[PDB]
Amino acid sequence: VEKVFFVTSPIYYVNAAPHIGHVYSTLITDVIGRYHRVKGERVFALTGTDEHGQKVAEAAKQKQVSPYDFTTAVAGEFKKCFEQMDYSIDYFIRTTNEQHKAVVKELWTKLEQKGDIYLGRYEGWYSISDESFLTPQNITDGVDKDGNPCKVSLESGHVVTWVSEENYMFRLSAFRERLLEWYHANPGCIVPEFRRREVIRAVEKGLPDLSVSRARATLHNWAIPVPGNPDHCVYVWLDALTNYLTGSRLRVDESGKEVSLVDDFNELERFPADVHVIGKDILKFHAIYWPAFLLSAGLPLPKKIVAHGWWTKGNVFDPVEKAEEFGYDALKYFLLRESGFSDDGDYSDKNMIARLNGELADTLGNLVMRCTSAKINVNGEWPSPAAYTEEDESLIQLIKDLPGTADHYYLIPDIQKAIIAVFDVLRAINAYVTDMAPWKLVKTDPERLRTVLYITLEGVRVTTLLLSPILPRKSVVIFDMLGVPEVHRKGIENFEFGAVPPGTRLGPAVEGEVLFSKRS
Ligand code: MET
Numbered sequence: 001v002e003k004v005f006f007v008t009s010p011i012y013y014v015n016a017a018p019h020i021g022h023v024y025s026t027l028i029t030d031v032i033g034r035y036h037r038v039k040g041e042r043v044f045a046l047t048g049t050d051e052h053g054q055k056v057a058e059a060a061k062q063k064q065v066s067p068y069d070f071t072t073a074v075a076g077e078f079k080k081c082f083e084q085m086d087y088s089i090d091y092f093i094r095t096t097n098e099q100h101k102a103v104v105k106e107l108w109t110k111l112e113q114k115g116d117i118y119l120g121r122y123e124g125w126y127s128i129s130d131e132s133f134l135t136p137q138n139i140t141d142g143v144d145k146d147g148n149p150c151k152v153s154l155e156s157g158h159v160v161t162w163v164s165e166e167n168y169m170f171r172l173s174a175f176r177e178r179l180l181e182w183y184h185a186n187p188g189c190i191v192p193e194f195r196r197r198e199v200i201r202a203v204e205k206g207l208p209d210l211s212v213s214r215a216r217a218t219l220h221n222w223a224i225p226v227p228g229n230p231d232h233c234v235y236v237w238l239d240a241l242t243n244y245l246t247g248s249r250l251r252v253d254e255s256g257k258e259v260s261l262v263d264d265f266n267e268l269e270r271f272p273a274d275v276h277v278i279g280k281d282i283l284k285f286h287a288i289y290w291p292a293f294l295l296s297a298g299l300p301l302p303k304k305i306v307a308h309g310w311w312t313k314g315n316v317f318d319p320v321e322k323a324e325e326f327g328y329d330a331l332k333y334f335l336l337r338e339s340g341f342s343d344d345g346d347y348s349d350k351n352m353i354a355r356l357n358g359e360l361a362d363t364l365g366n367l368v369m370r371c372t373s374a375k376i377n378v379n380g381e382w383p384s385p386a387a388y389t390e391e392d393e394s395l396i397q398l399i400k401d402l403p404g405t406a407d408h409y410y411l412i413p414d415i416q417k418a419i420i421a422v423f424d425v426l427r428a429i430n431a432y433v434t435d436m437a438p439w440k441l442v443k444t445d446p447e448r449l450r451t452v453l454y455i456t457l458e459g460v461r462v463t464t465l466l467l468s469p470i471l472p473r474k475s476v477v478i479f480d481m482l483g484v485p486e487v488h489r490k491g492i493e494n495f496e497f498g499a500v501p502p503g504t505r506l507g508p509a510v511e512g513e514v515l516f517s518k519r520s
Pocket residue numbers: 009010011012013050240241242243282312313
């Protein structure tokens with residue numbers, strides 16, 4: 001039952017540079033990973049690059065560079081981007097890696113031996129930009145790169161082309177009943193629920209067999225050869241999906257480089273994924289194809305697929321530019337708070353500033369300053385509380401209930417709802433402080449201040465602990481200001497109210513230090 005918590009992002013295409021969609025997907029992956037480490041579990045978080053296929057090769061042809069140099073360069077830009085964004089991903093995987101290819105061949109061979117791969121033809125539409133097979137119902141009319149009539153995808157609006165090849169075929173049609181059993185037996189396996197319902201409808205309709213090879217010429221020879229048939233290459237998505245299996249089997253050193261590939265996945269206790277984070281654009285591949293391959297191979301199926309609301313891939317939005325302007329943690333807070341499982345979000349500077357000023361500065365920041373202020377907290381310590389009033393007890397109840405509420409939300413996972421829950425408590429704590437007016441209590445009633453101050457400090461600690469996956473740097477600052485011992489900054493034991501004992505001294509002040517500075 002207890003294993004390493006395995007969380008993954010999709011592996012991104014290297015045809016263009018890093019951008020918001022990749023940053024978001026990896027941010028979600030990172031936060032889930034961070035939450036489970038704070039909870040005290042073992043974690044392996046995976047991200048990477050999808051480097052083979054027609055469109056990557058063509059993207060490299062256009063830049064007058066060999067596919068090897070082009071992919072190695074762009075992968076480097078992705079790695080730099082993720083270091084810059086301050087993630088805590090455990091490993092970065094590239095499909096060009098030899099161990100990955102080893103695993104692909106191994107999986108391919110398994111599927112072939114079970115009788116689930118046969119030689120056939122695909123005659124039909126294809127989107128090179130989505131590397132996706134389409135039926136005629138998923139295309140319509142549109143405009144070429146030059147401007148002529150042509151066909152485009154209803155899915156993405158990218159150009160389609162007709163394909164008539166002799167291909168290796170995966171017997172996907174044979175897995176319809178089993179996939180439907182899987183979805184019905186595990187009704188939390190796809191999130192959010194309306195995307196779960198979408199998948200089920202699709203599979204109910206019926207499943208065609210799936211092309212899993214292309215002729216080597218079509219792919220510009222930039223792909224993995226099919227075992228025992230050099231004229232064919234492995235489909236970029238069988239290749240790409242398999243990264244999760246590869247990553248589950250790689251021992252990794254202290255610096256982050258891969259070292260060794262185990263034979264049996266159970267050695268490392270990662271497979272299958274506990275959470276696959278993906279965009280909505282790639283749901284069919286993760287919820288239909290991937291499990292069908294795993295069923296064919298007799299491999300365990302993933303627990304959860306979370307499909308967020310942005311399609312994974314004169315109006316620029318540069319994450320690193322904005323994080324340099326508003327702060328890293330602040331931008332992360334905004335991206336995770338502004339949207340759930342929909343595109344709609346006012347990603348404007350007006351709204352980024354509204355939430356920076358309203359929530360992060362006025363609600364969280366102001367509250368940290370009030371409970372550490374030398375005017376209010378005169379001894380610079382956690383006081384021992386006196387007797388609790390019924391109003392005190394109501395706030396204490398909220399703080400006690402928060403961990404279990406936030407835990408359920410983080411496990412769904414619905415990170416927006418987990419933030420909202422924490423901030424509801426932060427608002428309540430502010431309301432309580434304005435009622436008790438502890439600044440007045442310093443002169444008039446000191447025994448009472450002890451109680452008010454203790455509750456405020458402990459509320460700030462518990463909320464900050466649950467926000468630490470969202471605001472990893474600022475949570476450390478906050479804990480330093482509160483003087484929270486290092487041991488108390490993680491572990492489910494410290495989700496409990498009263499974990500930091502009275503008499504703990506605060507961290508020292510800096511002359512005019514601000515936590516979140518208000519902009520405009
Ligand atoms: C197995 S995840 C693959 C995702 C795909 N390379 C994309 O960027 O959309």
